[PDB]
Amino acid sequence: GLGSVFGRLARILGRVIPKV
């Protein structure tokens, strides 16, 4: 992890309050 996972985490930030 650490940089490799950032790819997935990058979505949770968008899957919290996205454009919907």
Instruction: Locate all alpha helices (DSSP H) within the chain, ordered by sequence.
Output: 6-12
Cα atoms in the Cβ-side hemisphere of radius 13 Å centred on 1: 4
What kind of experiment solved this structure?
NMR
Percentages of the chain per state (helix, strand, coil), in multiples of 5: 35, 0, 65
> What does R_g of the chain's alpha carbons equal in angstroms?
9
The residue assigned the tokens 């996972």 is 5
- Expressed in angstroms, the distance from the first to the final Cα of the chain is 29
Q: Dihedral of the CA atoms 2, 20, 16, 8 (nearest 10)? A: -20
Amino acid 19 reads K
Q: Dihedral of the CA atoms 4, 18, 15, 10 (nearest 10)? A: 10
